[PDB]
Design a protein around this ligand. Structure first.
Ligand SMILES: CC(C)CCC[C@@H](C)[C@H]1CC[C@H]2[C@@H]3CC=C4C[C@@H](OC(=O)CCC(=O)O)CC[C@]4(C)[C@H]3CC[C@]12C
Ligand SMILES: CC(C)CCC[C@@H](C)[C@H]1CC[C@H]2[C@@H]3CC=C4C[C@@H](OC(=O)CCC(=O)O)CC[C@]4(C)[C@H]3CC[C@]12C
Ligand SMILES: CC(C)CCC[C@@H](C)[C@H]1CC[C@H]2[C@@H]3CC=C4C[C@@H](OC(=O)CCC(=O)O)CC[C@]4(C)[C@H]3CC[C@]12C
Ligand SMILES: CC(C)CCC[C@@H](C)[C@H]1CC[C@H]2[C@@H]3CC=C4C[C@@H](OC(=O)CCC(=O)O)CC[C@]4(C)[C@H]3CC[C@]12C
Ligand SMILES: CC(C)CCC[C@@H](C)[C@H]1CC[C@H]2[C@@H]3CC=C4C[C@@H](OC(=O)CCC(=O)O)CC[C@]4(C)[C@H]3CC[C@]12C
Lengths: 317, 261, 147
C-alpha cells in the first residue's frame, strides 16, 4: 500500500504530468505577473515566478553537471540559457533599481527591466512545445517546423530582395525631401512587408487621386507607385508566396518521414531523462537537492532462457 | 596465415574442418596478426595509436577512444595487464577479439564472416557499427588522400542494418523476450546495454524500430498499467493523492522486461 | 457530396495538433503585445479577450495596419506612446511570418498530402453508412414531422 505511492510517483508519466502541471501553473502566474500593473515591490505571484526560474536553473545546472557542448545541441536548451540569463538581467533591472518615485512609475531602469521581463515570456511559451512534442501525433510536427524553416530559407531570401527592391524606390519616389535618419530603414522595410500579409494600403496607392489619405504627397513622379506596387504584389503574392506553397507541398512527405524518425529517436533521450529527474516539480524542488542505474535484472535461469532465444532468432535469420 | 592474408574462404574451411579458435588465439597471436603489413592494412590505425611494435594495451586505448564515454575495454583492465607483461594467455571469447581486429584493420569480408558465428551477435553488430562510424568521423577530419570516410561509412551502415534486421527477426517470434534482448547487460562489451550501444552511434533505424519504441512505451508507464488505466486518472491522482491507491498497476510478471532502477 | 461531409470531420479530427501549435504561437504573440502596449492594467477578464482577440484576426487578413507603429504619425491609437512600444512591429512581423508563412502553409501541405487517403477512407465510410440511412427510411412513416 505504501509501495503504491513509491510505485506511482517514480513513474515517468507521473514525473512528466506533475512537471507540466506545475509548468502551466508557472505560465499562468507569469502572465498574470506580466499583463497586470507592475509595482515597486513584487507581488505574491512574482515571487512564485522567481522561485520557479531560480530553482529551475538549479535543476538545469544539476542536469549539466550530472559534456556542455552535448547539452547545447538541443534547440530547447539554447533557449533555456537565454531565458534564464535574460530573466535575471530583467529582474536585476527591475528590483535593483533607483525608484525616482512618482505617480508615474516609469524610470528608465525599471522600464527596461519590465520589457526584458515582457519579451521573456516568449521563451517559456516556446518551451511549451517541448511538452507538446512528447505524444505520437504532435511530436513530428514540432520536429518538422524547424526542419522546414531551415529548408525554405532561400525562398525567404528572394522574397526579401523583392521586398527591398520595392521598398526603396517607393520611398524614393514618394519622399524626395529627407535627411539621413534611421527611420529610412524602418520605412523602406515596413510598408512593403505588410503587403505580403493582406494589407494593400488601398488609399495610399494613387497618392495624387481623390478619395485618398496622404494627400500632401502629390509631387511630380508619384504616379509611378501604383505600377510598382502592382508589379510587387504580382511577383510577391502570385509567384513567391505561391512557390512557397508548392515548396512545402512537395517537401512535406520526405520531411514527415524524416521528422517522424527523428522524433522516435529523441523519445529515447526524453524518457531516460525522466528516469533521472527527482519526483517534484521545480517550485517544489527545494527538498530533493537539499536531500541529494536503470539496469535490467534477470535471474540465472532466465539469462540462459534468454540466451538460447537469441541464438534461435539468429539461426532463423 | 589465412587471417593475415585475408583469405576468408580458407578460414571457413579451416575452422570447419578441425581448428578451434579457442587455443588458436594466444596473446602473441593478436600482437602478431595486428602488427603485420602482409595483407590489406588500415593506414589510419596508426593515426589513432598516436594518442599514445603495437601492443594490445595501445589497441584498447584506441577502442576506448572510438567508443566514447565510459567504455572500458577488456585489455586495459588490471587482470589483463597482469596476465599481460608475462592456458591463461588464451581468450575466453576469441571471436569477440577478431571481430574488433577485423573492424579496426578495415577488412570487411573478414568482419562479416567473423560476426556471423559467435555468441551475442546483435551486440557485435552494434559494436562494429560504432567502431566503423567513429573511425569514419576520425578520418573525415585528418586525412588527405583516400580519406575513406565514404568507405567506413557504408561499413557502419552494413552492420547497423544487420542489427536492425536481427531485431526485426527476434521481434516477430516473441515480443517480451525481444525487449529483454535490448537491455540486458552484455558483460563482454563493458557492461553496456545493447540499446545504449545503439544510441552511442546514432543508429536511428534501431531506436525507431517497434521493439525499442515498445520498450520505451513500457518504461514510460513505469509500474502503472496504461493499457487499461485511464489517461485522465493520472492527472486526477496527481491532484487527489487518495486516488493513487485505487487505479491499477502491473505485477512482476509484467515488469520483467522493463529495466527497473 | 456525401464523402465531403464525411471528410470534413475526418480532417478536423486530424489537423488538431497543427491548430494547437498555431494557438501557442497565437498566445506567445498575444501576451507580450498587450504587456508592452498596456502597462497600466488592473486584473479583469478583458485581459483574456484582448490577448486572444487582436492576434487571432491576423491569421485571416487583418494586419491592423495603423495600430502597428503606435508611436508614428498616420496612426490610430496615438495615446499609447509609452516607452517600449517600438517593439511591437518586430513582434508582429515575426508573428505574421511564422503564422502565415509557416503554420497556415504547413496546414495547406497537411491537407494536400492527407486528402487522397482521407477521400479513399471517407468514400467507404459513406458507402457503409448509406445502409443505415436507407434502412431508416424503410421505417419512417410517410409524413414530415409537422404532419
Ligand atoms: C506524452 C504523452 C504521455 C501524452 C501527453 C502529452 C502532453 C504532455 C501534451 C499533449 C496535449 C498537450 C496540451 C494540449 C493543449 C494545450 C493547451 C495550450 O494552450 C492552448 O491551446 C490555448 C488555446 C487558446 O487559448 O487559444 C497549453 C498547452 C496544452 C495544455 C498542451 C500541454 C502538453 C500536452 C498536455
Ligand atoms: C512573438 C513571436 C516572436 C512569437 C513567434 C514564436 C516563434 C519565435 C516560435 C514559434 C515556433 C517555434 C519553433 C518551433 C519548433 C522548433 C523546432 C526546433 O527544432 C527541433 O526541435 C528539431 C528540428 C531540427 O532538429 O532541426 C528548432 C526551434 C523551432 C524552429 C522553434 C523556433 C521558435 C519558433 C519559430
Ligand atoms: C545588402 C543588400 C541587401 C542591399 C543593401 C541593404 C540596403 C537596402 C539598405 C538596408 C538598410 C539601408 C540603410 C538604412 C539606413 C541607413 C541609415 C542612414 O544613415 C545614417 O543614419 C547615418 C547618418 C546619421 O546617423 O546621422 C541612411 C542610409 C542607411 C545606412 C541605409 C543604407 C542602405 C541600407 C543598408
Ligand atoms: C458557429 C457558426 C459560425 C457556424 C459554424 C459552422 C460549424 C459550427 C459547422 C460547419 C460544418 C460543421 C461540421 C460538418 C461536418 C461534420 C462532420 C461530422 O462527422 C461526420 O458526419 C462523420 C465524420 C466521422 O465519421 O468522423 C462531425 C461534425 C462536423 C465536423 C460538423 C461540426 C460543426 C461544423 C464545423
Ligand atoms: C495553458 C497555457 C496555454 C498557458 C496558460 C494560458 C495563459 C496564457 C492565459 C490564458 C488566459 C489567461 C488568463 C486570462 C484571464 C485572467 C483573468 C484575470 O484574473 C482575474 O480575473 C482575477 C481578478 C478578479 O477577478 O478580480 C487575470 C489573469 C488571468 C487568469 C489570465 C492568466 C493567464 C491565462 C490563463
Amino acid at each position: 500500500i505504501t509501495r503504491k505511492f513509491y510505485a506511482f510517483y517514480h513513474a515517468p508519466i507521473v514525473k512528466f504530468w506533475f512537471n507540466t502541471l506545475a509548468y502551466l501553473g508557472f505560465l499562468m502566474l507569469y502572465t498574470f505577473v506580466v499583463l497586470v500593473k507592475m509595482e515597486q515591490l513584487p507581488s505574491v505571484q512574482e515571487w512564485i515566478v522567481i522561485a520557479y526560474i531560480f530553482t529551475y536553473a538549479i535543476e538545469k545546472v544539476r542536469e549539466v553537471f550530472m559534456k556542455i557542448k552535448v547539452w547545447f545541441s538541443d534547440y530547447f536548451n539554447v533557449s533555456d540559457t537565454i531565458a534564464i540569463i535574460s530573466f535575471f538581467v530583467g529582474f536585476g533591472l527591475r528590483f535593483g533599481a533607483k525608484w525616482n518615485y512618482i505617480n508615474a512609475y516609469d524610470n528608465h531602469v525599471f522600464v527596461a527591466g519590465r520589457l526584458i521581463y515582457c519579451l521573456n515570456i516568449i521563451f517559456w511559451y516556446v518551451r511549451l512545445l517541448d511538452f507538446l512534442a512528447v505524444n505520437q501525433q504532435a511530436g513530428p510536427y514540432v520536429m518538422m517546423i524547424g526542419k522546414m524553416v531551415a529548408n525554405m530559407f532561400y525562398i525567404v531570401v528572394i522574397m526579401a530582395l523583392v521586398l527591398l527592391s520595392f521598398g526603396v524606390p517607393r520611398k524614393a519616389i514618394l519622399y524626395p525631401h529627407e535627411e539621413p535618419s534611421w527611420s529610412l530603414a524602418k520605412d523602406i522595410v515596413f510598408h512593403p512587408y505588410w503587403m505580403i500579409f493582406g494589407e494593400v494600403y488601398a488609399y495610399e496607392i494613387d497618392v495624387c487621386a481623390n478619395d485618398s489619405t496622404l494627400p500632401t504627397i502629390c509631387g511630380p513622379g508619384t504616379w509611378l507607385t501604383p505600377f510598382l506596387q502592382a508589379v510587387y504584389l504580382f511577383v510577391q503574392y502570385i509567384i513567391m508566396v505561391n512557390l512557397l506553397i508548392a515548396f512545402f507541398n512537395n517537401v512535406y512527405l520526405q520531411v514527415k518521414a524524416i521528422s517522424n524518425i527523428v522524433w522516435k529517436y529523441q523519445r529515447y533521450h526524453f524518457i531516460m531523462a525522466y528516469h533521472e529527474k527527482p519526483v517534484l516539480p521545480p517550485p517544489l524542488i527545494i527538498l530533493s537537492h537539499i536531500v541529494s542505474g536503470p539496469k535490467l535484472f534477470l535471474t540465472e535461469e532466465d539469462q540462459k532462457k534468454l540466451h538460447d532465444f537469441e541464438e534461435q532468432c539468429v539461426e532463423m535469420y | 596465415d589465412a587471417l593475415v592474408m585475408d583469405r576468408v574462404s580458407f578460414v571457413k574451411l579451416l575452422i570447419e574442418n578441425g581448428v578451434s579458435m579457442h587455443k588458436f588465439l594466444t596473446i602473441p597471436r593478436l600482437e602478431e596478426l595486428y602488427n603485420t603489413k602482409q595483407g590489406p592494412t588500415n593506414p589510419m590505425l596508426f593515426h589513432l595509436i598516436r594518442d599514445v611494435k603495437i601492443t594490445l594495451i595501445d589497441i584498447g586505448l584506441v577502442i576506448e577512444y572510438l567508443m566514447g564515454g565510459t567504455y572500458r575495454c577488456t585489455y586495459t583492465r588490471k587482470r589483463f595487464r597482469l596476465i599481460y607483461n608475462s592456458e591463461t594467455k588464451r581468450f575466453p571469447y576469441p571471436l569477440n577479439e577478431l571481430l574488433i581486429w577485423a573492424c579496426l584493420m578495415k577488412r570487411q569480408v573478414m568482419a562479416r564472416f567473423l560476426w556471423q558465428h559467435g555468441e551475442e551477435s546483435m551486440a557485435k553488430a552494434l559494436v562494429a557499427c560504432k567502431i566503423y562510424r567513429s573511425m569514419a568521423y576520425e578520418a573525415k577530419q585528418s586525412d588527405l588522400v583516400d580519406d575513406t570516410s565514404e568507405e567506413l561509412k557504408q561499413y557502419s551502415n552494413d552492420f547497423g542494418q544487420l542489427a536492425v534486421e536481427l531485431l526485426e527477426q527476434s521481434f516477430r517470434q516473441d515480443e517480451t523476450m525481444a525487449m529483454k534482448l535490448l537491455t540486458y547487460e552484455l558483460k563482454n562489451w563493458s557492461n553496456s546495454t545493447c540499446l545504449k550501444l545503439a544510441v552511442s552511434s546514432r543508429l536511428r533505424p534501431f531506436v525507431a524500430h517497434t521493439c525499442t519504441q515498445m520498450l520505451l512505451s513500457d518504461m514510460w508507464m513505469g509500474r502503472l498499467n496504461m493499457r487499461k488505466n485511464s489517461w485522465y486518472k493520472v492527472i486526477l491522482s496527481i491532484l487527489v493523492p487518495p486516488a493513487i491507491l485505487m487505479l491499477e498497476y502491473k505485477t512482476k510478471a509484467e515488469m520483467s522486461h522493463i529495466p527497473q532502477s
